[PDB]
């Protein structure tokens, strides 16, 4: 269902390369025409080689072919849909009844499930099934886990928004520290867990937990290849500054926090800035973490709902 072949021809021609320039030493001119004509499955080992012949990025080729995630993939559409229902809650009922039963089919579906619970909580929509299943669900999913993948950090990241920290706490610890990078999407989610956790920690005034997360994020900066999120670096640092203010009590730390929050406004991130401000207000008043009215999300960018 992915025209990797047409793309290969496209790139080859655009760069003015002859077929003999690609298959020479890889395969017969006969079968190559089949690959390029998208009539013969292409192996990763082969595509990789063609990718070097062409000179174009391997992952870029896949993207051009249609690997642009969210494209079908089934679960991809479900995730983009979550954003829609957040704007049109009238579409919750029908869709939830569909996802809910298949929440444990795969780690992907569970994350989608948690996304829905967030919509229900935000619109005060009732979801009795939840409170009567999460514990078991989590047990079922992580009780015997060893290594974690990006989707896991995604799950835990969205789980922190629908379940008290005391319950998610235990599931997080084993997932850190991080030792290696496995793609930008992986680096994105592992940073989100720390950002979300550090927020709830500082908000509920759990200063020992807060330091842990500030240190875990700082550790990621020592792992070349992790590629840190600029926006997160800013947001996490503002929390780091509020943390210091709550301890070493120095107006400078608080002013820095404000300064950082303001920079978000100066660069056009109006939506995320408004949310930040709403958060500082709560922190300055010692309010514990409670799902706000401003719901922030992250797909390909850091955005707000409305």
């Amino acid at each position: 269902m992915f025209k990797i072949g047409s793309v290969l021809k496209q790139i080859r021609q655009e760069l003015n390369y002859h077929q003999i320039d690609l298959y020479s030493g890889i395969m017969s001119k006969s079968v190559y025409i089949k690959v390029e004509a998208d009539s013969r499955p292409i192996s990763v080992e082969e595509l990789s080689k063609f990718s070097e012949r062409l000179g174009v990025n391997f992952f870029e080729i896949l993207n051009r072919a249609g690997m642009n995630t969210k494209s079908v993939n089934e679960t991809g559409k479900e995730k983009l849909l979550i954003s829609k229902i957040f704007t049109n809650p009238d579409l919750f009922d029908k869709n939830f009844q569909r996802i809910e039963p298949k929440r444990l089919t795969s780690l992907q579906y569970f994350s989608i499930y948690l996304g829905y619970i967030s919509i229900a909580h935000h619109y005060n929509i009732e979801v009795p099934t939840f409170n009567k299943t999460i514990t078991s669900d989590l047990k079922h999913l992580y009780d015997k886990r060893t290594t974690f993948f990006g989707i896991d950090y995604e799950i835990v990241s969205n789980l922190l928004n629908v379940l008290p920290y005391e319950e998610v706490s235990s599931i997080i610890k084993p997932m850190y520290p991080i030792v290696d990078s496995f793609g930008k999407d992986y680096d994105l989610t592992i940073q989100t867990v720390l950002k979300n956790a550090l927020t709830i920690s500082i908000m509920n005034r759990n200063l020992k937990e807060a330091q842990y997360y500030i240190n875990q994020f700082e550790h990621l900066k020592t792992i070349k290849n992790i590629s840190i999120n600029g926006y997160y670096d800013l947001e996490i640092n503002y929390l780091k500054q509020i943390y210091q203010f709550l301890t070493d009590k120095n107006i400078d730390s608080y002013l820095n926090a404000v300064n950082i929050i303001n920079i978000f406004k100066i660069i056009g991130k109006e939506d995320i800035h408004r949310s930040l401000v709403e958060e500082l207000t709560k922190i300055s008043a010692k309010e514990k973490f409670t799902p706000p009215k401003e719901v922030t999300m992250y797909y390909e960018n850091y955005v707000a709902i409305e």
Partner: peptide
Amino acid sequence: LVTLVFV
């Protein structure tokens, strides 16, 4: 902030 991620 507590953000929802979806890859």
